Design an enzyme around this catalytic site. Sequence first.
Site, short mmCIF file in Angstrom:
data_model
loop_
_atom_site.label_atom_id
_atom_site.label_comp_id
_atom_site.label_asym_id
_atom_site.label_seq_id
_atom_site.Cartn_x
_atom_site.Cartn_y
_atom_site.Cartn_z
N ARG B 37 36.99 49.42 38.57
CA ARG B 37 37.72 48.19 38.21
C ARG B 37 36.64 47.13 38.17
NH1 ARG B 37 42.06 44.46 39.80
NH2 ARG B 37 40.91 43.54 38.06
N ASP B 70 41.27 46.81 46.99
CA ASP B 70 40.14 46.11 46.40
C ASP B 70 38.81 46.37 47.07
OD1 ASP B 70 40.95 44.39 44.13
OD2 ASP B 70 42.20 43.45 45.67
N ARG B 71 38.85 46.51 48.39
CA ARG B 71 37.64 46.58 49.22
C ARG B 71 37.64 47.75 50.21
NH1 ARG B 71 39.97 41.55 49.11
NH2 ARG B 71 40.82 41.97 51.17
N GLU B 196 36.26 30.84 41.53
CA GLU B 196 36.08 32.30 41.61
C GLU B 196 35.57 32.89 40.29
OE1 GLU B 196 39.01 33.37 45.23
OE2 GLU B 196 39.78 33.77 43.22
N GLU B 197 34.87 34.01 40.38
CA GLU B 197 34.78 35.00 39.28
C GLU B 197 34.32 34.38 37.97
OE1 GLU B 197 38.56 36.99 39.27
OE2 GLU B 197 37.94 38.43 40.77
N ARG B 212 37.66 30.92 37.49
CA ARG B 212 39.03 31.11 37.87
C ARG B 212 39.37 30.22 39.08
NH1 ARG B 212 41.18 36.99 40.07
NH2 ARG B 212 42.98 36.27 41.29
N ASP B 213 40.36 29.34 38.93
CA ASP B 213 40.86 28.51 40.04
C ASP B 213 42.04 29.30 40.49
OD1 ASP B 213 42.20 25.08 40.20
OD2 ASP B 213 42.51 26.74 41.55
N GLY B 217 44.89 25.51 39.44
CA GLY B 217 44.82 25.36 37.96
C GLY B 217 45.18 26.59 37.17
N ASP B 244 44.26 30.76 32.04
CA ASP B 244 44.36 31.58 33.22
C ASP B 244 45.67 32.37 33.14
OD1 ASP B 244 43.49 32.75 35.58
OD2 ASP B 244 43.64 30.89 36.77
N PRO B 267 48.45 34.01 40.95
CA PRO B 267 47.57 32.84 40.97
C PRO B 267 46.40 32.81 39.97
CG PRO B 267 47.11 34.30 42.78
CD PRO B 267 48.38 34.76 42.21
N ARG B 291 49.24 40.51 33.12
CA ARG B 291 47.97 40.85 32.48
C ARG B 291 48.23 41.82 31.29
NH1 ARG B 291 44.43 41.56 38.20
NH2 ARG B 291 44.44 39.28 38.46
N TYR B 325 40.80 41.72 33.59
CA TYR B 325 39.66 40.78 33.55
C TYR B 325 38.96 40.68 32.20
CZ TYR B 325 39.55 40.10 38.63
OH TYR B 325 39.79 39.75 39.91
C1 LIG Z 1 36.38 40.35 46.49
C2 LIG Z 1 37.71 40.85 45.97
O1 LIG Z 1 38.43 41.67 46.57
N1 LIG Z 1 38.12 40.30 44.81
C3 LIG Z 1 39.38 40.63 44.07
C4 LIG Z 1 39.99 39.32 43.49
C5 LIG Z 1 40.73 38.41 44.44
O2 LIG Z 1 41.36 38.97 45.35
C6 LIG Z 1 40.78 37.05 44.23
O3 LIG Z 1 40.09 36.44 43.24
C7 LIG Z 1 41.55 36.19 45.19
O4 LIG Z 1 40.57 35.79 46.15
O5 LIG Z 1 41.14 39.63 42.75
C8 LIG Z 1 41.17 40.84 41.98
C9 LIG Z 1 42.32 40.84 41.10
O6 LIG Z 1 42.58 41.80 40.38
O7 LIG Z 1 43.02 39.81 41.08
C10 LIG Z 1 40.22 41.81 42.06
C11 LIG Z 1 38.99 41.58 42.90
N2 LIG Z 1 38.48 42.81 43.52
C12 LIG Z 1 37.21 43.13 43.73
N3 LIG Z 1 36.25 42.32 43.39
N4 LIG Z 1 36.87 44.23 44.36
CA LIG Z 2 44.94 29.93 38.41
#
Ligand SMILES: CC(=O)N[C@H]1[C@H]([C@H](O)[C@H](O)CO)OC(C(=O)O)=C[C@@H]1NC(=N)N
Ligand SMILES: [Ca+2]
Lengths: 389, 389, 389, 389
Positions: B37, B70-71, B196-197, B212-213, B217, B244, B267, B291, B325
């Site tokens: 991902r 995610d982690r 973010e991101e 990304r806010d 936002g 967004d 969000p 999405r 994404y």
């Molecule tokens: C570090 C981390 O776990 N980041 C998340 C990210 C997220 O949770 C946010 O932006 C909210 O803080 O969202 C998403 C997501 O699909 O929304 C994937 C990312 N996953 C990975 N990067 N592994």
């Molecule tokens: Ca947003």
Amino acid sequence: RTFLNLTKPLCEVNSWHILSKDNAIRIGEDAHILVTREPYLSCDPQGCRMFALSQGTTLRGRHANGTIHDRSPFRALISWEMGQAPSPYNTRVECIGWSSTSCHDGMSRMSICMSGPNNNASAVVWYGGRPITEIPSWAGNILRTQESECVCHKGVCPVVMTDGPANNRAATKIIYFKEGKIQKIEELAGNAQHIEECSCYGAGGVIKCICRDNWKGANRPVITIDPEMMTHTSKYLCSKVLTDTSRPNDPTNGNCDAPITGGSPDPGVKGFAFLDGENSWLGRTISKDSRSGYEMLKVPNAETDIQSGPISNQVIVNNQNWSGYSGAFIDYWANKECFNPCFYVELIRGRPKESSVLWTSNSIVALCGSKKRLGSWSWHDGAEIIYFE
Amino acid sequence: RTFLNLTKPLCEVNSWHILSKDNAIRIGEDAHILVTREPYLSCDPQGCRMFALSQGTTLRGRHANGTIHDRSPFRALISWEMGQAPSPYNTRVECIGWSSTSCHDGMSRMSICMSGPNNNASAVVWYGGRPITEIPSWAGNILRTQESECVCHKGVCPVVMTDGPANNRAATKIIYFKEGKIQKIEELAGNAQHIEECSCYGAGGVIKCICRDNWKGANRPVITIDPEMMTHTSKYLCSKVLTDTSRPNDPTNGNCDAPITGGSPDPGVKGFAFLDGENSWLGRTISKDSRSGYEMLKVPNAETDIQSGPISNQVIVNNQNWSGYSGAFIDYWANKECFNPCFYVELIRGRPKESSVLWTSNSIVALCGSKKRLGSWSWHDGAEIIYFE
Amino acid sequence: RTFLNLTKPLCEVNSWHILSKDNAIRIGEDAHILVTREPYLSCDPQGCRMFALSQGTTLRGRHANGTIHDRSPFRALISWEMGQAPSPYNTRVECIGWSSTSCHDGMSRMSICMSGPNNNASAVVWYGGRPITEIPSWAGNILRTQESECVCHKGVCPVVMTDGPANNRAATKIIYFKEGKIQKIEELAGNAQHIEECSCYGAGGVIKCICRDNWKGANRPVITIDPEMMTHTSKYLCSKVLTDTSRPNDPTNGNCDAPITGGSPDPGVKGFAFLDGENSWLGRTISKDSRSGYEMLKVPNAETDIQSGPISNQVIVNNQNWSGYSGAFIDYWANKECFNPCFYVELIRGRPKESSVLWTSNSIVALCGSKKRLGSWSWHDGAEIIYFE
Amino acid sequence: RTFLNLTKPLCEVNSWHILSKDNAIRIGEDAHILVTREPYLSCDPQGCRMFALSQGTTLRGRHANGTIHDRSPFRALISWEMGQAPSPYNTRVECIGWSSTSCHDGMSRMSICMSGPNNNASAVVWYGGRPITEIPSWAGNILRTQESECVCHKGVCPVVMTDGPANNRAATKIIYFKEGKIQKIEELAGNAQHIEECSCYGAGGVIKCICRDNWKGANRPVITIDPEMMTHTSKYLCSKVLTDTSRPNDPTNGNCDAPITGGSPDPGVKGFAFLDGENSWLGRTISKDSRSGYEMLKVPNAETDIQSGPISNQVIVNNQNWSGYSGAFIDYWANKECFNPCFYVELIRGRPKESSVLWTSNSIVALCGSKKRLGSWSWHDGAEIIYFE
Ligand SMILES: CC(=O)N[C@H]1[C@H]([C@H](O)[C@H](O)CO)OC(C(=O)O)=C[C@@H]1NC(=N)N
Ligand SMILES: [Ca+2]
Ligand SMILES: *[C@@H]1O[C@H](CO)C(O[C@@H]2O[C@H](CO)[C@@H](O[C@@H]3O[C@H](CO[C@H]4O[C@H](CO)[C@@H](O)[C@H](O[C@H]5O[C@H](CO)[C@@H](O)[C@H](O)[C@@H]5O)[C@@H]4O)[C@@H](O)[C@H](O)[C@@H]3O)[C@H](O)[C@H]2NC(C)=O)[C@H](O)[C@H]1NC(C)=O
Ligand SMILES: *[C@@H]1O[C@H](CO)C(O[C@@H]2O[C@H](CO)C(O)[C@H](O)[C@H]2NC(C)=O)[C@H](O)[C@H]1NC(C)=O
Ligand SMILES: *[C@H]1O[C@H](CO)C(O[C@@H]2O[C@H](CO)C(O)[C@H](O)[C@H]2NC(C)=O)[C@H](O)[C@H]1NC(C)=O
Ligand SMILES: CC(=O)N[C@@H]1[C@@H](NC(=N)N)C=C(C(=O)O)O[C@H]1C(O)C(O)CO
Ligand SMILES: CC(=O)N[C@@H]1[C@@H](NC(=N)N)C=C(C(=O)O)O[C@H]1C(O)C(O)CO
Ligand SMILES: CC(=O)N[C@@H]1[C@@H](NC(=N)N)C=C(C(=O)O)O[C@H]1C(O)C(O)CO
Ligand SMILES: CC(=O)N[C@@H]1[C@@H](NC(=N)N)C=C(C(=O)O)O[C@H]1C(O)C(O)CO
Ligand SMILES: CC(=O)N[C@H]1[C@H]([C@H](O)[C@H](O)CO)OC(C(=O)O)=C[C@@H]1NC(=N)N
Ligand SMILES: CC(=O)N[C@H]1[C@H]([C@H](O)[C@H](O)CO)OC(C(=O)O)=C[C@@H]1NC(=N)N
Ligand SMILES: CC(=O)N[C@H]1[C@H]([C@H](O)[C@H](O)CO)OC(C(=O)O)=C[C@@H]1NC(=N)N
Ligand SMILES: *[C@@H]1O[C@H](CO)C(O)[C@H](O)[C@H]1NC(C)=O
Ligand SMILES: *[C@@H]1O[C@H](CO)[C@@H](O)[C@H](O)[C@H]1NC(C)=O
Ligand SMILES: [Ca+2]
Ligand SMILES: [Ca+2]
Ligand SMILES: [Ca+2]
């Protein structure tokens, strides 16, 4: 390209950062991942590679059955790009055998494998991917070596080898190589009483090997090797923090010059330590009995002070997960003014601890030093044994 | 040979041509494809590569169960030849973690991964294939970064990072790297309230990051970086065209200096824009709620004009298909008098949107700009979920 | 490196030797082999490679269902080392689409793919593995090209493309490329009434394209290109020996300047010929109705003489086995004083002819001229369709 | 890079050390391994590769059924990095056919394959990966060659080829290549009565080939080639130590000049020996009847003395395990003052000996000489046949 020399000091280490993890068992549940054990890493001017003893079968293969067994004509030392899992599609055969060491002298890599029957094993020493030298068993009892990287200085690469009983006095030699050719052979000298599986690194013109006494001691032997004079001394880690597996509780005092006995039921495991006065770290399994969990412990003066204990810890693998072998390597070609310690932990899955499967294999995690105070988590294997049932 | 200078202007874009598609899920139904991902691409003087965060398991493996999460310690950033699918056989492990960025400075590739527990993550910064720098978490809350490529100028590569709440004020830094070493760290300054991101690109010596806010936002924050001075500003994309996900309907006016809030239930999602006066393009998912779909909108003066709306649209993924994404990249080493914009869309399959499967993963499509008026079609993932039941 | 110039004559050919065979269906029954069709070969200074249009699925994958279908967003031009089977692990993605051509100019390889919906397809032209030019559909009906290699001379690489009906007059163009950039565009001129799927080769400064007329002729059209002036003429192959499939019996005389009609049930197949006075060879399917068998026929002056018949023949695939497309290529970089003709035959397995399976795929055989009199046997696919049922 | 010159003597050999073992059957039980037979090894300036004739199908594939058959259009000579098992994913296709030789001349690799029907086979001779020459069958009866490496001197690489009966006087030629071009063709001269499958090495300007007489002899013919003059002689190996399979018990005296008849049930197997005065070693299967076991025998003066018997022995494969073909190779590019003898043993699995399976394949072991007295064990294939049922 030039021969490496070891004249830099060790780096200061206040914590450990994640270098690599191959997730081999998780990937090997489905993709075609070789069965292995006795892994390690080794570097050259170009980067770093993982090494291990293949069992000459994949994890899902029917031949995985019986892979607890240590020594067969079907084992070879394989190497591959750090991080990838070992498949039959991405692995270099270094040599054929069931015991190994390998190291790069700055010019080319030397790899060494023992094979043969227990009473008649032999080493074949390769340099530049070419066979150079053969050495027969001198004591006729499982001739064997480090199971982790050797270290070279000025073209000279010493390798510690042993031949003789697992449970009594054996015959350990230091052999000094240059471009795969024997320069000198030396019988073990000093107070270490039994020597197996040395984890070795150099710093400050000196090579320190930290070993497994499988005979009597729950404290680890240490061999200091001068690679220029081609001489060595041996003794034990002084610290009360005992780092072998199967070990008793830590005594109030360690013993620099004799094995401290005790622990049940296992006589030893391969392990390591970096010994740099205050900047000293000892690794160990978290269990005193079994190959589970893994912790790093900063023990100033572990090499000289029988009373020395930890001033800091980092859990590398938590005590609810299997570990195994552990060893030293360093990327001697890094662009730094010092040599930064690294270590791997072998993450053993299957038999004997998990016998709902027929095989024994492992994955790899590897970490290096940081001057920073980094947070940490557990780097266990992460495969569900129930998926293999 | 040389450090990439961001000298060239951006190419005129009137439509988007197919660059690459890996078809990873279709292939992964059989071949041994890694669960992933958070993909992106990045280029160097030789060519382009695909990147993603592996889950340390193949798609058909039983370990693919629970990969919505995610982690874990089993993720790592992997790269591979653009257009191929990621298997354990053709992937390079760049670093170990669950948030990443990567870019080439013209000489070597910097790669950055965060890993560790939420309250104690750390970055390891890799250069030319070796670990150079570690960075502790400053706010004990999931230190994280771009999830697409960084951008370098004269050896200086800024990276945007955030530590702190996902649903509140957080702590963002611009870190300026040269050969993996910190030259400067700035705290985020300007009108962006949450960051973010970030998806970044350079042209005429300016780096723009569109982010990304996740806090307020449905408009995307925009950070503008001068990599010589090593300074920045931040505000929001001015256009009433919100990009967004989970956004409300586009209002009558956007806001340059403050978030336009609203929308439900999610969000945020990583996205991107190219901003060059008249020649400005915005990507967004077609659904304002989920999405799905992907569209490209030519929105003249998006960065300056609160009333700016689309003058053309290209459907990239039809709204009957899952996206995910999106992020910016350029082939800065093209034989061209301009830097041509490119982007990728991550085609997420499985959970939570498809719950008839136990896993979550993705594939990649990538497109670059064209001066011509090209026809188009949907570049959806193309796998059949019924096949995995 | 220098630009290839077509200064050598064709070598004399009296039979055909085996060059390569990938056994892709036999091997794909277990190993992870991509579903392909429309294959070909193409060489550069270092050697030769196999190319084909992937279907973005492997042969045993569930997504192999429906692969009779010609155009989708999941198709890409893939190339791999000659004689290997194309799996996900060994194939380079050249471009994205469902119609291709490719050729090396002595410095770098140019590849071209069409993608899009029927009424809105585009070409992207790549040079040195980077995109250079885009060309939109001119007639809104399946912009399409050679499906075998193009030829270069002093860096000018002409390409034949068609846009318009499969079953009626279309709009063919000859595009002259140099380093991916358009130097000239010509509309088709002369006597060929319909042009598709040209198989082209160069000898002595002239390029000949042997093409498919899908509208009228069971004779094949021939375009002659001057790559220097950037001009062409076209007529039909004069010989009475008809080489298209679906074709009627060979008539008493051919026609240089108009199509010979008849045959059933199918309008056309891609095919080729080497045309060089006495030294002329015509391939065709053995069957006049179906895509089975393949034979080479030496027909001197086939190009110019309406009465020309075969003086020898070599069966390539026997008429009990499936064939398919065939095409021309040469190793223009061989250490020979002439250009030696080569060709391949696409060995189509599965739908429509074999409907006990849900897929369509192929394997490859390639053979080159010999000045000798070599024995021959059949190079049929060799997979057993019942294994796949 | 220059032409290899056979300027060095053979090394003293007292013992055999393990070089490589691919464990292909164990690994191919699961992982996608090509079915092969007729393996060998061949070296170049950079390293050594393994070679085999592929059956154009993997070991677990349904098309493995029937691979006892020696000749089909689906076979090819493949080469891979030494130690690896041959898969579709790591093998180079050298040429197409069912009989082969290959050797490197210090500049490039020459590879030759015969293919076609029994009465009309042809060789294609390849150099530097490009086809150079074609040779038709001169006797209309399975034109065929060494099944192991040729040897080159000053760019001149002799090859032994046979055409005509398996069980009667056949027509053998020695063909002298330079860069794949024919320099000279001689008919076999001397007292060898039948010649097949020569195993060839070089030392001190001389090439020796130890061949297989399928017609009458259980002793092995020997051809001695002068590569500079391009002239040869032939006879039989003198020694009472008979080394073909099927053979009778060893007689009191051997015969340098006529076949020694007898043995059952097999007319022949490919084999090898190194002949160097006192330093002479003969390979053979341990069984006199069958392709089981393998043993090395130091037989001083085997080449000149009919009463010469073994002074030492090494068991290579025990007589409880299947063996197969065997052949000579040398790393002529080793950093040594002598040419050191190596050999492989093809370890055959499946039919005819093991007919609970439908396929025939093999794995490989290779060994090279040592001046040392090294211990040994049996390097059998190691696969369990029950797993394939
Ligand atoms: C570090 C981390 O776990 N980041 C998340 C990210 C997220 O949770 C946010 O932006 C909210 O803080 O969202 C998403 C997501 O699909 O929304 C994937 C990312 N996953 C990975 N990067 N592994
Ligand atoms: Ca947003
Ligand atoms: C560890 O391995 C080391 C290797 O260095 C050992 O050493 C080998 O030891 C042997 C003595 O035990 C060697 O033996 C001698 O052989 C020669 C010639 O041998 C062959 O020829 C005679 C006459 O034709 C046959 O009778 C022989 O039959 C033996 O060998 C064959 C395999 O070829 C086997 O199939 C038979 O059943 C039989 O056991 C044979 O064909 C004789 O003249 C001499 O009298 C003596 O027997 C051998 O040369 C030596 N090898 C090397 C290499 O050095 C040592 O045995 C092992 N040590 C331990 C503790 O196991
Ligand atoms: C130890 O190895 C280092 C590293 O190559 C070394 O080399 C340099 O030192 C000389 C002077 O002694 C220089 O001036 C070079 O600029 C340095 N080179 C590099 C590449 O850093 C030492 O000479 C070696 N020492 C020994 C004793 O071998
Ligand atoms: C072996 O196969 C070759 C090539 O096909 C061959 O030669 C052909 O002979 C037939 C009948 O005489 C022809 O009419 C062809 O025109 C010839 N083709 C070529 C390319 O020369 C032999 O006939 C065959 N030899 C045998 C013994 O079958
Ligand atoms: C992975 C795992 O279950 N590890 C166990 C661990 N578990 C916990 N402390 N929770 C405790 C020990 C122990 O200290 O004895 O080691 C393990 C153990 O039970 C044994 O070694 C005995 O066989
Ligand atoms: C891939 C797909 O079919 N996506 C849905 C999309 N589809 C179509 N309009 N066809 C419609 C919407 C929507 O109107 O919100 O967004 C998507 C959605 O997520 C949901 O409807 C609820 O999960
Ligand atoms: C491979 C195969 O068996 N092909 C058939 C072939 N076979 C033989 N001559 N044996 C006969 C012909 C033919 O010559 O018309 O064409 C083929 C055919 O299928 C049809 O004509 C019907 O579609
Ligand atoms: C590998 C294997 O089992 N080989 C058999 C072996 N004997 C034993 N292993 N017991 C020895 C012989 C033999 O010396 O003739 O014969 C072999 C044999 O079985 C046959 O020749 C049958 O055709
Ligand atoms: C050469 C050899 O077999 N070494 C053994 C080693 C061992 O038995 C001892 O240390 C006792 O002497 O232990 C272990 C072990 O897990 O304890 C694995 C090693 N396996 C392999 N290296 N293959
Ligand atoms: C662009 C396209 O779809 N070309 C078709 C081609 C075709 O339809 C005609 O020649 C009629 O105009 O036919 C065939 C065919 O097998 O006849 C395969 C090609 N498939 C692919 N190139 N993908
Ligand atoms: C060309 C050919 O088929 N050669 C045969 C060979 C043979 O039959 C004879 O030597 C009798 O002349 O024997 C064998 C064999 O296993 O005995 C393998 C070879 N198979 C292959 N090389 N493919
Ligand atoms: C595993 O190996 C055992 C001893 O060789 C044995 O006999 C058992 O049947 C075999 N089991 C499987 C499942 O292969
Ligand atoms: C084995 O091959 C033969 C020959 O075609 C055959 O007919 C048989 O059915 C095949 N067996 C299997 C299991 O495929
Ligand atoms: Ca111990
Ligand atoms: Ca037609
Ligand atoms: Ca014989």
